[PDB]
């Protein structure tokens, strides 16, 4: 995911990254949460 999906110039839909963050959180994926946080997703704007 880091070496292909998160390459430079990758277009991202609005709200899809937070949905992926939720899906990574419910499935207990530590490194995907790390990758999504390092790739722009912020906890303050996400967690409701």
């Amino acid at each position: 995911a880091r070496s292909q999906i998160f390459i430079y110039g990758q277009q991202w839909p609005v709200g899809s990254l937070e949905q992926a963050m939720l899906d990574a959180l419910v499935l207990d994926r530590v490194d995907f949460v790390k990758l999504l946080i390092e790739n722009g997703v912020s906890m303050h704007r996400f967690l409701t």
Binding site: I37, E38, G40, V41, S42, M43, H44, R45
Partner: protein
């Protein structure tokens, strides 16, 4: 354009992007004398030469 005191300066808390880092910032005019800005970095931001 008209000239006025600034309203956009302080500290920025970078939310997201992994590591949390705080960065000072000022909005300045493009025609300001650089000596005053140098005094800003040396005094207000506590940066050595």
């Amino acid at each position: 354009t008209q000239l006025s005191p600034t309203d956009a300066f302080g500290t920025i808390e970078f939310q997201g992007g992994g590591h949390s880092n705080k960065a000072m910032y000022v909005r300045v005019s493009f025609d300001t004398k650089p000596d005053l800005l140098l005094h800003l970095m040396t005094k207000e931001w506590q940066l050595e030469l």
